[PDB]
Every structure is written in C-alpha cells, then in structure tokens.
Design a protein around this ligand. Sequence first.
Ligand SMILES: Nc1ncnc2c1ncn2[C@@H]1O[C@H](COP(=O)(O)OP(=O)(O)OP(=O)(O)O)[C@@H](O)[C@H]1O
Ligand SMILES: Nc1ncnc2c1ncn2[C@@H]1O[C@H](COP(=O)(O)OP(=O)(O)OP(=O)(O)O)[C@@H](O)[C@H]1O
Ligand SMILES: Nc1ncnc2c1ncn2[C@@H]1O[C@H](COP(=O)(O)OP(=O)(O)OP(=O)(O)O)[C@@H](O)[C@H]1O
Ligand SMILES: Nc1ncnc2c1ncn2[C@@H]1O[C@H](COP(=O)(O)OP(=O)(O)OP(=O)(O)O)[C@@H](O)[C@H]1O
Ligand SMILES: [Mg+2]
Ligand SMILES: [Mg+2]
Ligand SMILES: [Mg+2]
Ligand SMILES: [Mg+2]
Ligand SMILES: [Zn+2]
Ligand SMILES: [Zn+2]
Ligand SMILES: [Zn+2]
Ligand SMILES: [Zn+2]
Lengths: 332, 338, 338, 338
Amino acid sequence: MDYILGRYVKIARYGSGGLVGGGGKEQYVENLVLWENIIKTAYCFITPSSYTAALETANIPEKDFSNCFRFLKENFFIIPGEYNNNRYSRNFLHYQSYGANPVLVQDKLKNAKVVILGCGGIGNHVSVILATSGIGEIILIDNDQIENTNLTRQVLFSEDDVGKNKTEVIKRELLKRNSEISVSEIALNINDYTDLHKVPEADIWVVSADHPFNLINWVNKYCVRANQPYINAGYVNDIAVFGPLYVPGKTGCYECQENIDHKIKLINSRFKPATFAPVNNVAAALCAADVIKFIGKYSEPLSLNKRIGIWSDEIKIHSQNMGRSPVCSVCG
Amino acid sequence: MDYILGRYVKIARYGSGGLVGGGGKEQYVENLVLWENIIKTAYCFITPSSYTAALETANIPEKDFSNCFRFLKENFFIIPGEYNNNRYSRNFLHYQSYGANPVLVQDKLKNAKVVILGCGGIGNHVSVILATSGIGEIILIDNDQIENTNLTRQVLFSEDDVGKNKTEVIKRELLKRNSEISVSEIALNINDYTDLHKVPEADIWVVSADHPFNLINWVNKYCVRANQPYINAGYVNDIAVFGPLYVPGKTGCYECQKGSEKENIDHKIKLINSRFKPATFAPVNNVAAALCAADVIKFIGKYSEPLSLNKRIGIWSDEIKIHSQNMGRSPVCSVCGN
Amino acid sequence: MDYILGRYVKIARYGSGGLVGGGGKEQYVENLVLWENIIKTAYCFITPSSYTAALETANIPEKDFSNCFRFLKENFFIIPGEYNNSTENNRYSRNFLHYQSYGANPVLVQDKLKNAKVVILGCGGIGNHVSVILATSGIGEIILIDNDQIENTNLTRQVLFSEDDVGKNKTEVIKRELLKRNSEISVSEIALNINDYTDLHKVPEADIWVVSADHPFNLINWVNKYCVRANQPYINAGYVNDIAVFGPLYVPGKTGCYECQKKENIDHKIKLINSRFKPATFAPVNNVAAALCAADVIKFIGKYSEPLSLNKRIGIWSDEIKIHSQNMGRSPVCSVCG
Amino acid sequence: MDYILGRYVKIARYGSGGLVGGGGKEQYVENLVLWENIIKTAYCFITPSSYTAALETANIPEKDFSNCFRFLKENFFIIPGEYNNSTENNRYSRNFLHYQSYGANPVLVQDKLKNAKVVILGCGGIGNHVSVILATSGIGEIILIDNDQIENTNLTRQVLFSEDDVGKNKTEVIKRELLKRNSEISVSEIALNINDYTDLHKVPEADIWVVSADHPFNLINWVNKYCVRANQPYINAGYVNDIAVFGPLYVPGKTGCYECQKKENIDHKIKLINSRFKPATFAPVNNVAAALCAADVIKFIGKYSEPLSLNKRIGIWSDEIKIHSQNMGRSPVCSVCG
Ligand SMILES: Nc1ncnc2c1ncn2[C@@H]1O[C@H](COP(=O)(O)OP(=O)(O)OP(=O)(O)O)[C@@H](O)[C@H]1O
Ligand SMILES: Nc1ncnc2c1ncn2[C@@H]1O[C@H](COP(=O)(O)OP(=O)(O)OP(=O)(O)O)[C@@H](O)[C@H]1O
Ligand SMILES: Nc1ncnc2c1ncn2[C@@H]1O[C@H](COP(=O)(O)OP(=O)(O)OP(=O)(O)O)[C@@H](O)[C@H]1O
Ligand SMILES: Nc1ncnc2c1ncn2[C@@H]1O[C@H](COP(=O)(O)OP(=O)(O)OP(=O)(O)O)[C@@H](O)[C@H]1O
Ligand SMILES: [Mg+2]
Ligand SMILES: [Mg+2]
Ligand SMILES: [Mg+2]
Ligand SMILES: [Mg+2]
Ligand SMILES: [Zn+2]
Ligand SMILES: [Zn+2]
Ligand SMILES: [Zn+2]
Ligand SMILES: [Zn+2]
C-alpha cells in the first residue's frame, strides 16, 4: 500500500528540536536529530510512496526510518494513499487528520438525514454548516415568519425576506450554496407532545426550538421511546449551550441527572433572552460539529453525556454531567 | 427617575433559596426570606417606576426594599427606565444586561468604521455580525476570487458566486441584510510591509489574512507605529484562535512575547510548508469568527471588556479545552517599547 | 449603630482575674473587678445592641462601661453589627469569623478575593496545597503553570492527586479538583516550563505569583529579576529539607528583592555534588510552608492583616521547636533593584 | 562496608569558608581549608565506597580525611550504602530521603508504618489533613471515627471533600478519598459520637489516637482519662482561633498527661458567652496544626526522630512570627495519672 503526507502537516524548528503538525495533534520533538529524520521521512511521502520505496529514497538507517514512519503514521501525519483524492476537499483534510477515510465519511454524510427542529438563530447557522458539508437530506421544521429583529443572528435572511416563512428562506438559501442536497420543509409548531409524531425519523434531530419550557422534555421522552438520536443547542443569555447528544442505549438522556407564586410566574412569563449573535453562533457551530462527528463516525462528539456551556464575558467552558442514571424516570 | 425590571431576568426556586438572573450574571441566594424579598421587589418594577412609587406597592419593610433594590440595580436586573425607550432590539437587551444605555452603545457602533482585512471564512462571518449589529462603516479588503471549496465556511457566498471578487460578493450580501450601513472595497494584497499604508485608518482592523507566515508581524509593527487598534482571528487546523486585541498604550502587542541551518534539511522543510493547507472545519472557523466579532463589538461599544485584551485564545474542538497565550505588555518589547 | 460580640471570643477565670479572647489576642486581666466589668459589658452584645441601649443594660457605671466598650471594640471582640451578615449563602461562612477577628468586614474581604487573580507557578507539593486553600477561600481567578505529568511518588504530598491520575498533566488534574471543590471560581492552565529567563514573559500578570518551581537552582533569581522589572508581586515558598520556608513576599517599591541581602580543584567538585541534590521532601514540611504561603497571599489581597513574609524569608524547623526569620529588606547596592 | 553521600546534601561557599548540609543539620565551617577538605571527602563518597576505597581517591592526608569522614557520618551526610537500596520508583521514595537524613534505614521505618494502626478521632479539618498525610506515607491501617455529614461550610479546610459530597458521611468520603490515593493500605470507619466518657470504650486499641474532636469542651478531658487508664497513646491537635496547636503526645509512663499541669450572676454570663463560642477557623492555621501533628505520629511510629510534642502543647501563631510550648510534663501529684 501507498502512503502520503497530509497537507495539514506543518514543520517548525523549535527549542532543542522542532514541531511536527498543527492544532490538537501538534507534536514537540525535543531531539533535533530525530526531528531532522522525521523531516527526511515526510519528504518521501509528499508524493505517494510505499514504505520500501521511501526507505530507499530517505537513505537513513532502517530502524530510524521505521521510527519516523511509525510516528508520522500514528499521528495521521502520513495516511494511506487511498485516503487522498472537489467541493468538500477542505473537509477531507479535516477527516484525514483524525485518521479517517474522507470518502467513507463523505458517503455517510451523503446518506444521512437531519431534522432541524427550530429554524431561528441556531437553525440558520447549523443548517448551512450541514448543507455545505454535504449532509444528503435536511428537513426544516418551524411555523414562524421572518421579522426584522431576526437579522442580527439569522444569517441566511435578508431585509427583503421579512414576512416570509423561515423554512422557505433557509431552503432557498441552502440550495443556492449546495444544490446537490435535498431540502424539505414542514410548517409545524409543536404545541403538545403528540405533535412530535409529525417530525420524521432521521439520523439525528437538531433541537433548538425553545417554547414552551418543557418542549425539551417532550422531545426527550419522545426520542427515548422512538430510539431517535437528538442534540440540544441554544443559549441562556450570554452563555452558549450545546448538548446533550442523546444516543439510544448508549448515553444518558436529558432526564438522567403562595401569593409569591403569581409573582415568580409573572416575572418568568415576561422573560426574553439578552443575547448576542456571537453567543448564538458559538452554540450552533459546536452543535454542527457534534452532528458531523456523530454521523461521520470519525471522532467522538463532545456533548455525549454532557451539556456544555461556553461563557462570553469570561474565558470559560464548562460541562454539566448528563451521564446515564439507572434510576432515570424516562430511560431505563 | 424610573427604574424597570429587565426582560432578560428570570428566577428559579432552588436549593434553600433561589436563583436570580440568567447566564453569567446569575446569582444564587441561599437565604429563602431574602430571595423572596428580591422577587417581591423585582415584581414592583415590572412597570417603569421610581423607587418611591415601586415601594408604595410593596408589602415588605422599607429597609428590605432598599437592600433588594440595591442588589437588583447592582446586577443590572433593574435599569433606568430611559434605557428601555428597532432592528437592534435583541442586542439592546444584551447591552442593558451589562448596565449600559443601549441607545448610546448603538450610536457608537453607528459612528464606527471597521476594516475587514481578509474576506475568507473569518472575514465572512465577522463582517455579517458587524453589519447586522449596525457598525456604520465597513471596509472590505482582499484580492482573491471565490472558489467552490470556499463554500464550506464562507457563508455569504453562493455556488453562482464562484470566480467573483470576495469583496464584491460580501458587499452585496451585507447591504442585502442592512441597507442602513456603508460598505466599500479595496482590491489589495499585502505583499510587503510597505503595502500596509494603503489600508485606511479605522476604529479597528479585523485581521484574518494569513499569507505569508509573517503578515501578522507586519500588521503588528504597522499598527503599533500607526496607533491603529487591531484584532487577529483564525485557526490552527482544529484549534479556533482569536486575539490579541491590540489597543495602543493599553495592551501588549503581538511581539511582546516574541527552516534549518543545515541546507539539506532546510529545503525539505520549505517544500513541506509550501504544500501546507489547514485541516479545518466550519465549526472551528465560526467559533473564532464569532468570538472575534464579540470582541470588536465590545471594544467599540465600551460596555464590557473584550476577552482578547493581552491574550491569544485557542479553543480546542476535539476536547473541552480553552487556553490563553500571554500577550501583556513587555517593557523590553522590540516593537512596542516606544 | 449596632455592635455584636464576635463568636470567636473566649472567656475564662485564670490567676487573679481572667482571660479575654482566644489566640493571638488573648489578654490576661489581673484585676478581677475590671475582668467582671468586661464580661458584663460583653454580655449586652451577644445579641446586637447600640452603645446607649447596652449602657442601660449593664449594671456598671458609665465611666467603667466606656472603658470596657473601647477595650472590646479595639480588640475586635465586639464588631459592627453589619459585619455579622448571618444570611450570606454561604460557601465562605466559616472564614468570616477570621476576618471579623482582625476588625474587617468579611464581605468586603470576600469581594477583594473574588476580584483577584493568582498565578501558581509550579503545581507540585507546594502548588497543590496553596491552590486548594486559595480556591476554597474564593480567590476569583487561579492560573496554573506547569508542564509536568503526575508520578506515583508525587502522592506523598500532592494532595489533589489520586493513583488514578498518574500519567496525566498536573495543571489539568488540579483544575479538575479545584472546580469540584469551588464551582464558583475560574481556573485556567498554561503548559509551560521555564527553560530560561525569557520564558517568564509567557507567565501573565496577576495580583501575585506563588513561586514554588525550583528547577534549575537559579529559577528563583530569574523570577525575581523579571518581577522587579515587571512590577509583579510574588511570594516564594518551599523547603530546605526538613525546614519549611516561605517568603520573601516581594512588593514593588515596598520591600527588598530576593537579591538585596545577597580556587580550581574544588569548583568542579562543588558543582558535581550540588548537581546531584534532591531535597528530603516530607509532607508535614511541605504542608506547613504551603499553608503559611497561602495565608500571606490571602492577607496580601484581603488587606485585613500584615503578611508575615514582607521583607523576610521565614523558616520553620520540623525537628526542633523553632522559627527563624531572615531579613530581606531593601539595599541601595542591589544589582537588581538598587 | 560501603558508604554513600546523601542526595539531600548541598554545599555552598559562604563567609570565610562554607556551609555543609541543608535544613536543620546545615553547618557553617569558618575555616576555608577545612571546608574544602570536607568537600573533597564528600566527593569520594558520591559512588558507594568503603572508607579505604574512598580514601584511595582522596588527594588529602589521611588525618584530614578521617576527620571529614567523621563529620559527614555523624551528620548522616554519608549513610550506609544499603540504605540507598530501594527503587527510585518506590511510592515512598521521597520520604526515604527524609528518613536517611536522620540516620535511619528507610526500609525499616517503612516497615514500622506498614504495621501500624491509627485511629482518627474527628474527621473535620484536622482529621482530613492528618489522615491523608498518614495514608500516603504508608500507615497500614486507618480507622475513621465521626458521626457527622458533610456540609457546604466544610469545604474551606476539609481538603478531601467536594461539593458533590455534601450530605454524605464524613468518614465514608474520607475512606473513599484515602483509598484513591493509596490502595495499598486498610481503612475502616466507625459511626460514633462521643456523648459521654463511657462511649470511649467503643474506640479501638491502636498505636496512637489522633484526637481533634472538640465537643463538648471536656471531651479532651474524657479522652485523656480513658487513655491513661487504657494505656493508650494519643496526640491532640487543633487551634485556638489564629493559633495552630498540636500536642500533647501522651505516651503511658513516658510523658505527662493532659491534666498534669492543669456570685452566680457573672457565672451565668460567663457560661452563655462561652456556650456561644465558635473558633475563627482559617485553613492555613488548621493545616499547620494537622501537618505537625502528622509529623509527630510518623516519628512516634517510625522511631527515627523525637516527636516535638512529647511533654508539650505547642502553639504556632499566624499573625506574628512566633512558636511557643506549654509544659505538660509529668506531675507525681496528678489526679489522673499520678
Ligand atoms: N414548539 C415549537 N415548535 C416549532 N418551532 C418552535 C417551537 N418553539 C420555538 N420554535 C422556533 O424555534 C426558533 C427559535 O429561534 P429564535 O428564538 O432565535 O428565533 P425567534 O424566536 O424568531 O427570535 P426572537 O426570540 O429574538 O424573536 C424560532 O424560529 C421559533 O419559531
Ligand atoms: N497578504 C494578504 N493580503 C490581503 N489578503 C490576504 C492576504 N493573505 C490572505 N488574504 C486573504 O485572506 C483570506 C483568508 O481566508 P481563507 O484562507 O479562509 O480563504 P481561502 O484562502 O479562500 O480558503 P483556503 O485557504 O481554504 O484556500 C483569503 O480571502 C485571502 O485572499
Ligand atoms: N522551570 C520550571 N518551569 C515550570 N515548572 C517547574 C519548573 N521547575 C519546577 N517546576 C514544577 O514545579 C513543581 C515542583 O514541585 P515538586 O518538586 O513538589 O514536584 P516534583 O518535581 O514532581 O516532585 P519530586 O521533586 O519529588 O520529583 C513540579 O510540578 C515541577 O514540574
Ligand atoms: N464527641 C465527638 N465524637 C465524635 N466526633 C466528634 C465529636 N465532637 C466533634 N466531632 C467531630 O470532629 C470534627 C471536628 O472538626 P471541625 O470542627 O473542623 O469540623 P466541622 O464541625 O465540620 O467544621 P466547622 O465547625 O467549621 O463547621 C467534626 O467532624 C465533628 O463531627
Ligand atoms: Mg425565540
Ligand atoms: Mg486561505
Ligand atoms: Mg521537584
Ligand atoms: Mg466543629
Ligand atoms: Zn434518562
Ligand atoms: Zn510589544
Ligand atoms: Zn534588590
Ligand atoms: Zn497526669
């Protein structure tokens, strides 16, 4: 078999040796001689080569070459030549760097179906990422119409779209960006649990709809019954939220873990979130990544068994545990 | 003077007492009696009311009312009624929650001019947040045309836009979303340090251009000499990066914390790096662009401290991980020690 | 204005009269009549009372009541009633009596701690112990600096670490454990080993650096040089075998710095012996040094009592009953700060 | 017949001569030539060497060598070669250098600890800190006695406990936490509140009891009387507000016991004031008392150095640099042990 150097591999002289790779998998090789040999080895795989052929070309001791080849291979700095090959080419570099076959990942995305339940801030941003990453079918669910105030966060919408159906404009704008995918709309506000039967089975549901307060509870109980994976995303004012990502039988579910009354109920009935496009976009982006990773199967979604928050007025990411509980009211 | 309960405040009975507020400002008050007083007081300011007028309707001691009033006012859960007097409505709740007068914040955004240096994935997402938040003038700078591969992250672009100038298409799409603002383009590629004088002065530069490796170093040197604020944003493969936000005389600069000697290794390094293409991913791009844009809005708006002052911040995407690189002022810096 | 008796006040019959207070503030009152007058005055303040209301309650002459009131007030045995704040959450409730006993309003001390940043430079034996005291006392932002992984031998004193944690990064496990203990604060990490002086620019500004990193032997001299130049407060803590050491607490422009009071056939032999040095670590010694270090930090930021280690290197013996202090006052002939 | 230089040995040129050793054993040798000779001699024992083998590599007269050998041996700067015969990988290896420096064979000290049993009577701030030190130094059996559950307020000092632990038995969580740190030892619990002297019979025989339970006030008096009658060694530790306190360490027939050196109107006022007493807790003070308590336990059982609190109650101040010992020497007169 042939191997090839990933284009995502950068090399830098640093400290007593140097760096190989960039991002999460960046390696610090302290020993300069080892680092120089890794360079000599990587050089042989810029164009695809078998191990024996590169061994000849590199002209360093076989034991050293074997060391360097192994190091490059384990970190997916060099990859099976078969994994090399296109509109998705940049995403391919991503899948490659996790040690996946991008063609198999792309095929999984192409054959997947994603429900977007809620086509507001989060729906807009999640739906574009998924569509342009080649998710084969996207179903858009909302009964609301576009308003001028939506435009701060709802990136697919224009001034001219005010008054039109949310699902209609998303579908239009999605197809402008990737005409290879199929998009559906369902004009549907979930008023009671039974309405969830109108939401089709899919690989995963992206749930950002937020009214009423126990919508997420209905969705959860429904999806546990239906063996339907879903992921929740949103915000609480300045905090971006994504997760949990519920996987039937594998992860925990959402549930696992008086004249004062009319005053609290009144105050809470008037609540409107004080939030911010950047907050919205962070939640949606990380939600979309967990969806791609879940369907593509190349890396573990972050929000399995977790509800993750990202703060905007300080530097902070924190997770609330949503691990499985054998005493759970809904699952088990 | 009237005060009013912000609509972004919510309350929950919790533990021994309860929670007041949502998000980063949320307060847990363990004492039941005190929590119950804070909500009763909050309730009196649902309609815009002076302290005395609200107190008239309350049925708790005057001294408890004051304590609670003080608590609410300090956390910006109640605000001057004038602050609540529009496309930017949702943004207004945000500003209010930081104790700011949203009309004054909005006017500062209206009077602002922002340079978008680099109109790729970062520049796409930043420019549209800025435009729809009412930044008054935006200047688009790039010399590249759209390619089909751009579409995974460059959210303003359609299939039909392949081959067109990125600046042209961004402008079209921004004015489609906010016709109340001013957008202009400069077809420029920064080739040398000496090209930077061709970039206009602005409230801030959003720098996401990345070619060659030392462009950021030239931008830093120039902006330090020019008294020009800038923010850098981008990614390193799977790591979303924003910062530093350089502010003349206030923060450190990019350089405050600042191939091969063997020829047969050097040329191998150079070829490898010439073939470099980042292994990244819309979610990574979008996180960096979003936090960048938040820092621009806060820097201009003045209502909250931008996160990337004195910091280059990385957000990992395959782990729960955020780390900061120190970019505080060095009194020995070879660029900003004026 | 109400006054209230501190709960930390202790009274006992002793000698010819009695003792008032416990700890550093304990006072032997030989005169029985004045001792009895002190307790009669104190008795009026168990529940909060004004000077005048209490004056009428006491069976003692105005003259004697005045003397006894001032006695109690000046020793902070009675404190302003507002300092009691009985209805605080409270995570930190236990610490309040300590602040009260020094005449401070605990809620104001608590606020200073919440608004502080502390860098822990070195996340070993000393770092474990200091960081946890600081986190649970409510220092608002803690920055963990180290590049080392946990080893089984670390477990004798690196209290936050479990057998299960061997192999993991020290900063990551400390962060995890600190947030399990106090979810209300912020913790961050920097994967960094100071290899030369210039790596110190990678350590951010904070209210104070807690320095227990010890490799190489002159790391402390680099740190000192940097902090003087950077106007950065720091406290050093560690041990010399069986003696626990904390201090100096360097304060820019207030204290001396670390350097202020500073053949042929031998040199190679001296170098060799010293290059082999390993401290005789012993948890009790480590823990004492870390504890008193942490006290000086809390007091430095809290401002309610003088840190012990201002202008001083303090050693506590473990095989003798002994504490000795080494002067580290300013020198005009100092090569670093003179 | 081999000797080896201690790894804990350091030297420095100082004054007219130099320093040898670090910690309590540091010696200043004013004579340059003598100091130089000690270095040359110490150098000869870096590798494990007999007196004769080392002397053959020394470039100094045998009389000078003999005297330097004697100085090094007396101070345990050089130790028997076999005392260094364990793995650097032994979990207790750091403690081993500590034992070496006191002239003990670390394997034998460790054997004594492995076979010891220690009762922890009181699982609050002191018991938390003592128990982990003892667990991770290799005390073979630890018995935890308390009847309280974990509260939010505990977390300031109670280092083994976390927010999630609230509501759980103190002893259950300590056990879990101790075994996570050292799975090579045995840890038991007894749910017991000592309500009267008669309850002390339910506390197991052990090598020593660590006593930090504090309620009622005469609990120490009960413990002392029982232990004297039951021939049971015990150490007391705690605090009196800002003063850390450890001792006495009672050893049947070898030390004094606790009681050795010991209108109705104001009487009732005294009682109510004292009934109201709550210590001004502060983690640094707690941890100091616990650390030195633990040191005394390890030395009592290890037998390599004298526990400090034999015949003494020792106070360490926190707001001044001060350590003081109250005599608790044996009295023939004593009503309890006399
Ligand atoms: N029960 C529900 N069924 C279907 N869609 C829902 C339900 N509840 C909420 N949604 C939709 O989910 C989306 C939530 O997104 P978002 O709140 O950003 O939009 P919005 O409500 O128009 O904006 P704003 O709250 O600022 O007016 C909305 O489009 C809303 O119509
Ligand atoms: N020196 C420079 N001067 C001006 N613009 C620049 C310079 N270097 C880079 N840019 C621009 O900054 C943007 C970088 O964004 P990005 O890399 O996401 O886009 P891209 O290059 O089209 O995509 P890809 O890197 O996937 O090919 C590009 O539009 C590029 O043209
Ligand atoms: N120059 C340096 N930069 C950063 N961290 C350092 C430096 N020198 C020492 N440290 C860190 O400071 C800590 C010192 O603590 P300590 O010596 O108790 O731990 P240790 O070195 O792991 O243990 P031992 O000395 O018993 O092997 C270590 O965690 C070490 O990694
Ligand atoms: N008579 C007794 N019998 C058994 N255990 C006791 C007795 N008296 C006290 N204790 C225990 O000894 C410990 C004393 O330690 P400490 O006072 O630090 O703990 P705490 O009471 O949890 O802390 P705080 O008093 O600050 O709330 C407590 O855990 C307490 O339950
Ligand atoms: Mg909505
Ligand atoms: Mg590019
Ligand atoms: Mg060390
Ligand atoms: Mg207690
Ligand atoms: Zn469940
Ligand atoms: Zn600079
Ligand atoms: Zn000095
Ligand atoms: Zn006695």
